[PDB]
Design a binder for these strands. Structure first.
Length: 159
RNA sequence: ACAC
């Protein structure tokens, strides 16, 4: 899947592209095209998946527009929201078994691969065996506090 | 709330 495309959500009715330009400028995140602002959400592409990930980590839930914290996520069309998830803000020196002991509560883990990342926290992509499993895992693990880190879970494109 |  195309992992450099971002979805930006939780925007106020009169969010303008200039607002998003400013936010990305100050976070030192390059974009490769213009911001496309709809109603309450928007889209923009980054030059590559590394910048797109840095944007999610730096911005999402963290920077405000008109007092509303923006959401920044991988852009994933509904038909590609199936089995695959990305988990971020994992405590740095956590070991597989502890993470795994969480993951298997929601189904069978076909694949799990760690993502290279600037931050001290870890990031992994996970493939479950069905759409239903992945949805439950997202619903119960997003926001889960683990060794004082808040896990963040979201869809990445599935084929 | 993921693009007439």
């Amino acid at each position: 899947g195309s992992m450099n495309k971002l979805y930006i959500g939780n925007l106020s009715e009169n969010a303008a592209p200039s607002d998003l330009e400013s936010i990305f400028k100050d976070a030192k995140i390059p974009v490769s095209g213009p911001f496309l602002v709809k109603t309450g959400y928007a889209f923009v592409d980054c030059p590559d998946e590394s910048w797109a990930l840095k944007a999610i980590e730096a911005l999402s839930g963290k920077i405000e527009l008109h007092g509303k914290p923006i959401e920044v996520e991988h852009s994933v069309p509904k038909r590609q929201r199936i089995r695959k998830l990305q988990i971020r803000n994992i405590p740095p020196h956590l070991q597989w078994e502890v993470l795994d002991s969480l993951l298997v509560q929601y189904g069978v883990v076909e694949s799990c691969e760690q993502v290279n990342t600037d931050s001290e926290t870890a990031v992994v992509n996970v493939t479950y065996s069905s759409k239903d499993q992945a949805r439950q895992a997202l619903d119960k693990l997003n926001g889960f506090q683990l060794e004082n880190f808040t896990l963040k879970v979201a869809y990445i494109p599935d084929e």
